[PDB]
Amino acid sequence: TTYADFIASGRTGRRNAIHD
Amino acid sequence: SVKEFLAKAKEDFLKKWENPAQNTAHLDQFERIKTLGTGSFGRVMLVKHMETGNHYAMKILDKQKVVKLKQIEHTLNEKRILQAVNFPFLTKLEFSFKDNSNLYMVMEYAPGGEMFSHLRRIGRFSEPHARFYAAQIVLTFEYLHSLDLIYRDLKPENLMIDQQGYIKVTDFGFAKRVKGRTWTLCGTPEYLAPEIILSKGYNKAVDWWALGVLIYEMAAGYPPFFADQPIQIYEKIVSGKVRFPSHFSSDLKDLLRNLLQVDLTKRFGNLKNGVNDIKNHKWFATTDWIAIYQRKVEAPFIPKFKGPGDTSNFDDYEEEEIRVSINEKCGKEFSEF
Numbered sequence: 599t600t601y602a603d604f605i606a607s608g609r610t611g612r613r614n615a616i617h618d
Numbered sequence: 619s620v621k622e623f624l625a626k627a628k629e630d631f632l633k634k635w636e637n638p639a640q641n642t643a644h645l646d647q648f649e650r651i652k653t654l655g656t657g658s659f660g661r662v663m664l665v666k667h668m669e670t671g672n673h674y675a676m677k678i679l680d681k682q683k684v685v686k687l688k689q690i691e692h693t694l695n696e697k698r699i700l701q702a703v704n705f706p707f708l709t710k711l712e713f714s715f716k717d718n719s720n721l722y723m724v725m726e727y728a729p730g731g732e733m734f735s736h737l738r739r740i741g742r743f744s745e746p747h748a749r750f751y752a753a754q755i756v757l758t759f760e761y762l763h764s765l766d767l768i769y770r771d772l773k774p775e776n777l778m779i780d781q782q783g784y785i786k787v788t789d790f791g792f793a794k795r796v797k798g799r800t801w802t803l804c805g806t807p808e809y810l811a812p813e814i815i816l817s818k819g820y821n822k823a824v825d826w827w828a829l830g831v832l833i834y835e836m837a838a839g840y841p842p843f844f845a846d847q848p849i850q851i852y853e854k855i856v857s858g859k860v861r862f863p864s865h866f867s868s869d870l871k872d873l874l875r876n877l878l879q880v881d882l883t884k885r886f887g888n889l890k891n892g893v894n895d896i897k898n899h900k901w902f903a904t905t906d907w908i909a910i911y912q913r914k915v916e917a918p919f920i921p922k923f924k925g926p927g928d929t930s931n932f933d934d935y936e937e938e939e940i941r942v943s944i945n946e947k948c949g950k951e952f953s954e955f
């Protein structure tokens with residue numbers, strides 16, 4: 599499931615901003 | 619009316635924008651209680667203002683770290699904007715100051731914690747629950763955009779819940795007052811509009827794309843474009859394909875198709891009719907926009923509130939000194955702060 603793929607990913611914690 | 623409210627709002631903003639408040643407190647006027655969260659060049663702490671006993675959130679930025687990360691002008695933007703705005707779903711600065719080492723911004727404390735925490739824990743929000751938050755974002759952006767401000771970092775991590783269950787948009791590190799196009803590559807991967815990723819000049823339309831991502835994430839429990847690495851996420855965002863969970867209502871999907879629209883001539887919020895294309899969409903049919911602004915709608919989630927200065931809705935972070943050098947750092951860079 600997409601839920602399961604999300605929870606198993608490394609991006610379920612607080613996500614940092616990007617910048618140049 | 620809306621147009622009249624926003625005109626008066628702009629008169630209030632411009633006066634403060636052109637003559638910013640400066641050096642309106644000192645660190646010794648506050649008691650530091652706990653770290654609410656951290657960033658690359660700073661942290662936000664719960665503090666108590668000793669004069670009043672009022673609790674505030676205090677954002678502490680290390681000047682040398684801001685310089686190293688090339689965020690000088692962006693930080694000046696943040697302070698200048700936040701001292702000048704005033705809106706129910708934003709935390710304006712109550713005070714600001716600096717010392718030898720740090721920059722300080724003091725704002726109303728939201729004790730309900732981050733929307734992020736509740737969203738991940740609960741899994742997802744119902745459509746009514748997601749709509750209640752979305753309405754407050756729609757009004758905030760209408761306010762901000764009318765002042766020629768772009769926000770550029772919408773995500774659940776930046777949305778704090780107050781004692782009444784209403785939200786505060788926080789962290790204006792990438793906010794900018796700009797009338798034309800701007801070019802800075804900034805934001806959070808999952809929330810970047812395709813224009814940003816493809817290095818085009820972009821405008822406030824990126825905030826409306828970001829709203830699409832937020833609404834999707836709140837309703838699904840995960841964002842429309844994710845992967846293990848940002849580059850994979852950027853590939854998904856540009857490709858022009860999104861999938862909706864089967865539980866998404868017809869109305870929700872249509873709103874999202876119009877918000878997550880790569881074609882800027884078609885993206886809701888960026889058309890001739892402006893924000894009203896969003897406000898008058900079927901998905902918002904049950905939204906009383908004035909009642910939300912007035913904070914008369916009952917929140918679908920009200921947080922645990924055990925008392926003043928309660929931090930139970932925030933995570934724990936290792937507490938570190940606020941060290942103040944005997945020598946002034948970066949005096950010229952932050953002179954206007």
Ligand SMILES: Clc1ccc(C2(c3ccc(-c4ncnc5[nH]cnc45)cc3)CCNCC2)cc1
Binds near residue numbers: 612662
């Ligand atoms: Cl430098 C820095 C430090 C911490 C934050 C975060 C942050 C934490 C708390 C608050 C905050 N909490 C409570 N009340 C507030 N009023 C204004 N900001 C508040 C705002 C931003 C951003 C969202 N994820 C957690 C860290 C951003 C930037």
